[PDB]
Amino acid sequence: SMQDPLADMLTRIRNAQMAEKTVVSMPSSKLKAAVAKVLKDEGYIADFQISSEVKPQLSIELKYFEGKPVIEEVKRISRPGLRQYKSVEQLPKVRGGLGVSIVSTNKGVMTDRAARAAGVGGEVLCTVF
Amino acid sequence: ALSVEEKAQIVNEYKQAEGDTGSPEVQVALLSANINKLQDHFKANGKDHHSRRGLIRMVNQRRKLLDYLKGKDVSRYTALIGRLGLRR
RNA sequence: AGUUGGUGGGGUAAAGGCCUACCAAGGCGACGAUCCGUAACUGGUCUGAGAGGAUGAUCAGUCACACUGGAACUGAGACAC
RNA sequence: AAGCGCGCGUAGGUGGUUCAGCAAGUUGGAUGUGAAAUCCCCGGGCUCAACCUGGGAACUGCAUCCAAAACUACUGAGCUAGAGUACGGUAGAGGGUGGUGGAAUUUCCUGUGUAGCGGUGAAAUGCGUAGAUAUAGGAAGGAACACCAGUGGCGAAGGCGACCACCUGGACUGAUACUGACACUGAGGUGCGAAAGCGUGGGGAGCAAACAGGAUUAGAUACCCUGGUAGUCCACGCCGUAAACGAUGUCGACUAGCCGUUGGGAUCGAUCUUAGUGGCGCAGCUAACGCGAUAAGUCGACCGCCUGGGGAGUACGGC
RNA sequence: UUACCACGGAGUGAUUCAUGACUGGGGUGAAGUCGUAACAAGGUAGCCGUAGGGGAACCUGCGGCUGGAUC
RNA sequence: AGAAGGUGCGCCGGCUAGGGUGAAGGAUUUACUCCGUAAGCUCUGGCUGGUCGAAGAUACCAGGCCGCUGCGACUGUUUA
Ligand SMILES: [Mg+2]
Ligand SMILES: [Mg+2]
Ligand SMILES: [Mg+2]
Ligand SMILES: [Mg+2]
Ligand SMILES: [Mg+2]
Ligand SMILES: [Mg+2]
Ligand SMILES: [Mg+2]
Ligand SMILES: [Mg+2]
Ligand SMILES: [Mg+2]
Ligand SMILES: [Mg+2]
Ligand SMILES: [Mg+2]
Ligand SMILES: [Mg+2]
Ligand SMILES: [Mg+2]
Ligand SMILES: [Mg+2]
Ligand SMILES: [Mg+2]
Ligand SMILES: [Mg+2]
Ligand SMILES: [Mg+2]
Ligand SMILES: [Mg+2]
Numbered sequence: 001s002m003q004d005p006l007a008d009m010l011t012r013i014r015n016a017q018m019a020e021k022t023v024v025s026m027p028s029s030k031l032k033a034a035v036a037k038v039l040k041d042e043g044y045i046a047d048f049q050i051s052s053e054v055k056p057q058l059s060i061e062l063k064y065f066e067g068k069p070v071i072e073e074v075k076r077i078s079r080p081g082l083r084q085y086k087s088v089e090q091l092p093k094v095r096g097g098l099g100v101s102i103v104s105t106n107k108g109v110m111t112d113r114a115a116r117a118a119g120v121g122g123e124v125l126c127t128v129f
Numbered sequence: 130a131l132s133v134e135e136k137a138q139i140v141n142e143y144k145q146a147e148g149d150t151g152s153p154e155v156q157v158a159l160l161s162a163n164i165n166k167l168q169d170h171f172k173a174n175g176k177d178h179h180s181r182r183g184l185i186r187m188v189n190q191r192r193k194l195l196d197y198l199k200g201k202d203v204s205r206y207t208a209l210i211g212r213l214g215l216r217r
Numbered sequence: 218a219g220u221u222g223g224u225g226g227g228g229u230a231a232a233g234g235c236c237u238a239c240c241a242a243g244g245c246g247a248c249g250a251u252c253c254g255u256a257a258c259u260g261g262u263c264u265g266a267g268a269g270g271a272u273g274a275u276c277a278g279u280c281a282c283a284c285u286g287g288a289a290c291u292g293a294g295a296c297a298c
Numbered sequence: 299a300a301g302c303g304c305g306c307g308u309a310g311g312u313g314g315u316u317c318a319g320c321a322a323g324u325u326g327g328a329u330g331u332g333a334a335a336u337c338c339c340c341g342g343g344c345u346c347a348a349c350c351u352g353g354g355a356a357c358u359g360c361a362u363c364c365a366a367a368a369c370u371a372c373u374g375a376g377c378u379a380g381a382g383u384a385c386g387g388u389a390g391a392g393g394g395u396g397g398u399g400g401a402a403u404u405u406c407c408u409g410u411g412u413a414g415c416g417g418u419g420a421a422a423u424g425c426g427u428a429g430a431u432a433u434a435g436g437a438a439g440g441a442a443c444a445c446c447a448g449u450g451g452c453g454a455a456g457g458c459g460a461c462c463a464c465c466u467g468g469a470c471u472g473a474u475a476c477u478g479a480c481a482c483u484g485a486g487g488u489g490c491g492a493a494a495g496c497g498u499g500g501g502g503a504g505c506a507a508a509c510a511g512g513a514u515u516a517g518a519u520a521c522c523c524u525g526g527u528a529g530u531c532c533a534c535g536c537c538g539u540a541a542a543c544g545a546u547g548u549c550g551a552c553u554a555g556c557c558g559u560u561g562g563g564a565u566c567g568a569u570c571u572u573a574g575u576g577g578c579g580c581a582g583c584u585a586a587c588g589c590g591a592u593a594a595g596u597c598g599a600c601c602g603c604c605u606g607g608g609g610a611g612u613a614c615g616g617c
Numbered sequence: 618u619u620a621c622c623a624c625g626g627a628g629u630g631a632u633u634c635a636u637g638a639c640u641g642g643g644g645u646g647a648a649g650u651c652g653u654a655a656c657a658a659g660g661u662a663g664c665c666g667u668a669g670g671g672g673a674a675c676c677u678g679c680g681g682c683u684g685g686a687u688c
Numbered sequence: 689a690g691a692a693g694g695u696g697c698g699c700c701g702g703c704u705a706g707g708g709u710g711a712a713g714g715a716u717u718u719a720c721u722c723c724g725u726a727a728g729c730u731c732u733g734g735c736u737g738g739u740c741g742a743a744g745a746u747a748c749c750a751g752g753c754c755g756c757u758g759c760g761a762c763u764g765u766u767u768a
């Protein structure tokens with residue numbers, strides 16, 4: 001019944017990335033917007049736009065580079081059934097730093113690298129590589 | 130089992146915003162009227178389980194609506210319980 | 218059913234149903250009470266990449282016991298190896 | 299090996315979207331404690347090692363203060379994308395109580411008529427001159443509802459086909475208006491639940507466990523034939539089981555296409571769009587078969603269940 | 618002399634061990650006796666629930682499934 | 689099932705709680721009426737001492753109980 005909207009966002013991105021599409025549209029929220037922005041800063045997507053009119057729609061344009069999609073493995077970590085939190089010393093590494101893990105901290109939603117840069121841990125949302 | 134006229138007079142008696150058929154009170158009143166009306170039908174037809182399923186569904190709907198209304202506003206809850214003449 | 222709380226009093230080195238006389242009908246329990254079986258606990262030890270699993274010889278800390286069941290005396294301290 | 303037969307629902311678990319607050323969870327810091335020994339690092343002594351020994355690190359924990367506010371929790375105010383209500387229509391073996399039809403079987407009575415009927419792989423038992431089968435007319439009674447009929451429909455599942463009246467549940471379909479998260483799942487509990495079976499009382503045409511007789515056979519407590527009782531039917535009550543099966547839990551969101559079909563809508567026989575019901579098939583998945591928008595693909599929420607084969611879904615105990 | 622109380626008595630229950638004439642199934646055994654139920658259309662298609670019957674595998678009725686061959 | 693088994697019980701004081709009847713008074717329907725009554729009489733209790741005997745349900749009165757089995761379901765009837 002959409003008890004996790006972020007998992008729906010990542011599932012939509014993965015499913016339409018596998019299907020060789022160009023734009024993904026979904027209901028938006030101020031958390032999905034932060035996730036989309038942090039992906040944009042990491043070069044995993046082309047662009048994201050938020051619609052107006054009371055029921056905003058968020059649309060994301062994807063990248064392909066070669067014949068294979070740029071995002072090959074995206075996975076949610078902290079679900080509503082588990083709620084995983086980690087400290088600075090325990091922030092997970094995906095592909096030994098070749099990827100990124102999104103972390104929600106009291107300074108906002110950022111990457112694990114920025115998380116150690118500010119020295120603030122938090123909740124591990126998902127891992128992308 | 131309700132009629133058009135019966136539903137119209139029920140909603141008129143229980144409307145709260147002059148044209149609201151979705152407020153909890155109207156739905157509770159309609160469900161209570163239907164539950165009270167079907168009793169005499171089930172008195173004679175004891176072997177009709179298939180309709181008794183729908184009756185149970187209406188009872189459950191009324192229960193959930195009353196619980197929501199109690200959670201929201203206690204005064205309207207007590208007033209509705211008083212007018213409908215039901216235990217809880 | 219002193220069972221749970223209150224009051225007056227007693228008692229203790231000291232709080233306290235610890236005890237007593239009244240007043241009330243309370244307290245605990247599927248977040249496992251009660252009952253049955255088994256067992257001193259910990260620092261630690263052995264295994265394992267780790268997470269875990271098994272386990273409390275030797276050494277150190279605490280507890281309990283001293284043929285079996287009770288009781289008190291003396292004493293700063295014992296219900297006394 | 300492993301999805302409860304199917305629903306409803308209690309405790310619990312989880313929660314669409316905006317603001318604002320709070321600081322329980324969360325994060326960072328400081329302080330106290332976390333006995334010594336042991337394990338680890340750098341050393342020092344016994345000719346080396348085991349062994350002893352100095353300092354450190356560790357003891358991943360707990361507690362108290364300070365700070366932050368993204369997420370969860372809590373509080374106040376919102377919103378309409380989830381859920382529901384009001385209004386016209388559509389289809390349907392959905393359920394219950396009565397009444398009424400036609401075909402056919404059987405039994406009884408009566409007319410004509412005379413030597414077979416029936417059944418089989420071939421026979422026999424059985425029925426016939428105490429007049430059978432066939433044939434014509436009349437009467438009684440019970441049960442099932444040809445043709446329509448369909449990969450067709452409805453129902454939570456089990457299941458539901460003659461026609462009509464009365465009572466009654468749900469689903470599809472179109473626009474507007476309304477409520478404003480009222481939702482999902484669900485241990486326990488609560489109900490519904492084929493057939494066979496059980497109790498009391500009716501009814502009894504056909505079929506037919508048990509049973510009798512005739513065949514077949516080495517035997518035949520079977521398959522085949524002739525009969526035939528419970529039962530099958532009705533009312534009320536119980537029983538709780540099935541290869542109760544899609545051997546596939548419920549709910550929600552995404553992912554190329556082609557051919558049908560049942561209800562309903564739109565736009566101009568064509569195109570589009572919903573809710574079902576079928577056939578293929580790209581990715582993907584799988585041990586393979588195969589699944590493939592009605593997933594067994596990509597994901598979330600909750601529940602049930604499995605841990606080699608027998609013994610055994612058995613024994614004992616409870617209900 | 619009173620109060621408290623150990624040992625010890627009397628009555629009636631619960632639970633748990635061992636054992637018991639005699640009985641019921643199960644498993645494991647070896648060139649035993651009777652049949653041939655399943656696997657092929659296994660020679661009456663097999664299974665599932667329930668009822669009756671029979672030396673035994675099993676047979677028959679009622680409902681169900683395909684995890685059934687020919688077509 | 690009164691299963692089985694157990695505890696108390698006499699007499700004299702102290703304190704204490706209830707019921708019935710019932711003057712005076714009050715009311716109005718003024719009379720074979722309603723309420724209600726101090727004392728007296730009468731019937732139920734409670735917790736606290738003391739005291740005698742060998743023994744307080746002291747006499748008469750007044751169930752013995754339990755465990756396995758056969759038969760018949762039971763209450764009833766029958767050979768004056
Ligand atoms: Mg007391
Ligand atoms: Mg005191
Ligand atoms: Mg006290
Ligand atoms: Mg326990
Ligand atoms: Mg011990
Ligand atoms: Mg391992
Ligand atoms: Mg370890
Ligand atoms: Mg080790
Ligand atoms: Mg231990
Ligand atoms: Mg020792
Ligand atoms: Mg010590
Ligand atoms: Mg200590
Ligand atoms: Mg010590
Ligand atoms: Mg201590
Ligand atoms: Mg000690
Ligand atoms: Mg000793
Ligand atoms: Mg000794
Ligand atoms: Mg001693």
Ligand SMILES: [Mg+2]
Nearest residue numbers: 288289290296
């Ligand atoms: Mg002494």
Ligand SMILES: [Mg+2]
Nearest residue numbers: 288289290291
């Ligand atoms: Mg002394």
Ligand SMILES: [Mg+2]
Nearest residue numbers: 290291292293
């Ligand atoms: Mg002393």
Ligand SMILES: [Mg+2]
Nearest residue numbers: 282295296297
């Ligand atoms: Mg001591």
Ligand SMILES: [Mg+2]
Nearest residue numbers: 283295297298
């Ligand atoms: Mg001593």
Ligand SMILES: [Mg+2]
Nearest residue numbers: 283296297298
């Ligand atoms: Mg001692």
Ligand SMILES: [Mg+2]
Nearest residue numbers: 282283297298
């Ligand atoms: Mg000592």
Ligand SMILES: [Mg+2]
Nearest residue numbers: 301302547602
């Ligand atoms: Mg299931």
Ligand SMILES: [Mg+2]
Nearest residue numbers: 301303543547
């Ligand atoms: Mg199922």
Ligand SMILES: [Mg+2]
Nearest residue numbers: 302303304547
């Ligand atoms: Mg189920």
Ligand SMILES: [Mg+2]
Nearest residue numbers: 302485486487
């Ligand atoms: Mg259940």
Ligand SMILES: [Mg+2]
Nearest residue numbers: 302305487488
């Ligand atoms: Mg259930």
Ligand SMILES: [Mg+2]
Nearest residue numbers: 303539540542
């Ligand atoms: Mg079953």
Ligand SMILES: [Mg+2]
Nearest residue numbers: 306307483484
């Ligand atoms: Mg539910």
Ligand SMILES: [Mg+2]
Nearest residue numbers: 308309310311
């Ligand atoms: Mg709840």
Ligand SMILES: [Mg+2]
Nearest residue numbers: 003313314315
């Ligand atoms: Mg939310």
